[PDB]
Structures are given as C-alpha cells and as structure tokens.
Amino acid sequence: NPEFFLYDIFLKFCLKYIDGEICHDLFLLLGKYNILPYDTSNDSIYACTNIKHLDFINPFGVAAGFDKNGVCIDSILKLGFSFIEIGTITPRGQTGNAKPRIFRDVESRSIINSCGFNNMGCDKVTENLILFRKRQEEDKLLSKHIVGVSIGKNKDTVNIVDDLKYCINKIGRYADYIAINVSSPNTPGLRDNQEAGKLKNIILSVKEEIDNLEKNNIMNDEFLWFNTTKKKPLVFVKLAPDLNQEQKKEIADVLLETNIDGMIISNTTTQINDIKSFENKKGGVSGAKLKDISTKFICEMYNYTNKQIPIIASGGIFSGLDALEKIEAGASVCQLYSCLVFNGMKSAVQIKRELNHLLYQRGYYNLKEAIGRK
C-alpha cells in the first residue's frame, strides 16, 4: 500500500500539469518496465463470476482503448484486475486523429476522446500478445487471467467484415474472447453497422472464422488455443448508447438469432452536452456522466434478450456501489476506464473490497445471485 500511496501523488500532479495522453503514455511505460505495484491478495471466492464457460477470478477488468496495443498487459492485470480487453485493433496500423485528441475534466470525473482507432495494427499487437502468453505460463500472478481482444476496421476500409476476419485469423488463437466494436463514435460510419441487417451478417461471419481455425489444424486443441481457456475465443459485441429504443430491439433478437456469447454495454456517448470544458471539443464522452445512461441501457437489453445473453458492463464505474448497480441490472462482469484515470494504481484494490463489503451488507451469498435482481 505504501507503493500505491506514492503513485497517487504522481497521479494528482499528472492530472493538473500534464497533457492526458502524455500521462497515459507514462502509465504504459511504467507498466512496460514492471515498476507498478502488485495486488497479490487472494480474491474473494464469493465475488467470482463467469460469462458462459469463461471464468473470472473477480468481476473487474480494464476496458478496451486503455492498452490499445497490448504493450502493458502483465502490469495492468497484476494491479488486481481479473481481465483486460486490448484494442480496439485494426488489420493495419493507423495514426488516428490529431493530438491533442483526449481531454479530461477532473471536476466531473469525465473524459472526451477522438483518437480514431490509433494502433500499431494487428500483426504487431499479435506478437505482443504472443509474448504475454509466453510470460503468462511462467508467472503465477497471471494464471487464470483473461485477455480479450477488441477488433475493428480502418478509417479507410470499406468492408467492415474484411478487416475482422483478418484479425481473427491472425490473433484468434491467443485470445480468450473477441469483442466486435461497432460502437466507436470517432471513426465515421461505424455505428451504421449496428443496424440489425448489417450486424447479424457481421456476427455470423465472425463466429464462422473462429471455427475455421479450429477445423483445419493438425495439432491438438492444447496447442491451437495458446490462451487462458485453451478453448476457442468467445464472441462479444460492444454497443453504443446513442440508439433509439426500437433500434435496440432489432439488435436484441439478432443477438439471440446468432447465439452471441455476450454483449458489452456500453461504449462512449455523444449525447452529453452539459460539461463546460468539452463544449469546444468533439468526440465520445465517458465517465460519471455516462453512468446513469449505461445502467438503463443494460436493463433494456437484459429485457429484450429475456436474460439469455451475458452482459459485460461499461461506462461510469468508479465505486463498489456503481458496480452493484450494474450487476443488479443484469451484468456479470464490470469494465473500468475513467476510474483508472482518476483513481490510479489503487482502482482495482479499492473497488474490489468496496463491493465485497457491500455484498455482505445487502445479504447476498455471492455475486452471482445479485445479477439481474432488479
């Protein structure tokens, strides 16, 4: 804990004096050289959870966009997170929009971004994940930690599906699950793929390409799936909150039609117009202000899918209570982003015990029961 205390000092100075992207890069540099603190505590057995046959030692991971290139997986997980979603990645590396592209508002614990899927591309990120998977076998703090991969398209690409299949064939073996990103607001025209007709086509094509890796392989499953599950990656789809309610219904049954393994709710939003310092800026907003809207989006989709599609929660989770709200709404695991930005190295340590203490007070035996009790 003395270690976490020092990094909070650096955090505060960063938020006030340094550009956000520069801080974010320092974060990842510290992680790349393994000088962040560790959370070596046994996670409460009553707080574990699962998405279908995917097991999470605890209900908290890091959302996509934090480690877009998988250069910092070890150290983020060792902060106390049960999993991480890297990406979103694209087939080829791209620069994204021009800096400064991210702006934070400490006062409201909110953020606005317009990066534009900047990443090194899938060939490079794949070799980064392979190395992690090698280290994972050597490190007892990394065993049973889940790594998912968010996948998208390039600014230039016309065929959304052409980009996804390439990513899968390249990096599918090493992923525990795949997250289809059709919810980013800062790449023009991507959300249009969320319309049921286009989406169903995308899911089915994704699910297909995963199986073809399994089908044609001379070696056993033990050597094909170089991941944590030793099984083929699940398939999740991350959705945006800026949809009218009828659009949500058409998506729901498509998920049911395709037997999607899970749904991530939600992505950043553009509906927010209250925050002063973002009035000048463009892009998708995340943080506290996104909390209430994310929670509702969960209960609706949980409704439209008749509770048959596992939910991953995202958007405005800072507290152990914020988490229980997302779980009660029907979510099984929670993803964090803004919290890490405003709370720092201690984010996972703190939110885990808060939820633990809260589950006991509310009289829940374990976390699984609290799911969807609203």
Ligand X SMILES: Cc1cc2nc3c(=O)[nH]c(=O)nc-3n(C[C@H](O)[C@H](O)[C@H](O)COP(=O)(O)O)c2cc1C
Ligand Y SMILES: Cc1cc([C@@H](C)NC(=O)c2[nH]cc(Cc3ccc(C(F)(F)F)cc3)c2C)no1
Ligand Z SMILES: O=C(O)c1cc(=O)[nH]c(=O)[nH]1
| Structure tokens given for 133 | 């998977």
337 is an annotated ligand-binding site residue: yes
Rounded CA separation 160/152 (Å): 8
| Of residues 262-321, those binding ligand Z (CB under 6 A) | 267-268, 284
Rounded CA separation 103/286 (Å): 11
Interface with ligand Y, residue 4, by CB under 6 A: no
Which residue's CB is nearer to ligand X, number 68 or number 200?
68
Radius of gyration of the chain (CA): 19
Where does this chain touch ligand Z (CB under 6 A) — which range of 52-60, 111-119, 312-320, 345-353? 111-119
| Of residues 175-194, those binding ligand Z (CB under 6 A) | 181, 183-184, 186
Interface with ligand X, residue 120, by CB under 6 A: no
> Long-range contacts for 153-161 (Cβ within 8 Å, ≥24 apart)?
153/90, 153/117, 153/187, 153/190, 154/90, 154/91, 154/92, 154/94, 154/117, 155/94, 155/116, 155/117, 155/187, 155/188, 157/90, 157/91, 160/190, 160/193, 160/198, 160/202, 161/201, 161/202, 161/205
Give Cα separations from 157 to 152, 164, 189, 194, 340 (angstroms). Answer: 10, 11, 11, 17, 32
Active site includes 347?
no
Binds 23: which of ligand X, ligand Z, ligand Y, none (CB < 5-8 Å by kind): ligand Y
| Of residues 286-345, those binding ligand X (CB under 6 A) | 286-287, 290, 314-317, 336-339
Residues 6+ apart with CB under 8 A from 107: none
201 is an annotated ligand-binding site residue: no
314 is an annotated ligand-binding site residue: yes
Rounded CA separation 102/100 (Å): 6
Interface with ligand Y, residue 106, by CB under 6 A: no
Of residues 58, 75, 88, 350, which one binds ligand Z by CB under 6 A?
Answer: 88
Rounded CA separation 326/323 (Å): 5
Where does this chain touch ligand Z (CB under 6 A) — which range of 114-122, 250-258, 297-305, 365-373? 114-122
Rounded CA separation 133/175 (Å): 10
Binds 116: which of ligand X, ligand Y, ligand Z, none (CB < 5-8 Å by kind): ligand Z
Q: How far is the CB of 8 from ligand Y (least distance, A)?
A: 8
Which residue's CB is nearer to ligand X, number 58 or number 184?
184
Interface with ligand X, residue 268, by CB under 6 A: yes
Choose, from 108, 184, 266, 319, the residue flagged as catalytic.
Answer: 184
Q: Which amino acid is at 173?
A: R
Which residue's CB is nearer to ligand Y, number 26 or number 141?
26
Report phi then psi at 175, rounded to 5. -105, 145
Residues forming contacts to ligand Y in the complex (CB under 6 A) are 7, 10-11, 14-15, 20-21, 23-24, 26-27, 30, 102, 104, 111, 340-341, 344
Please list the active-site residues.
184
Residues forming contacts to ligand Z in the complex (CB under 6 A) are 65, 88, 113, 115-117, 181, 183-184, 186, 267-268, 284
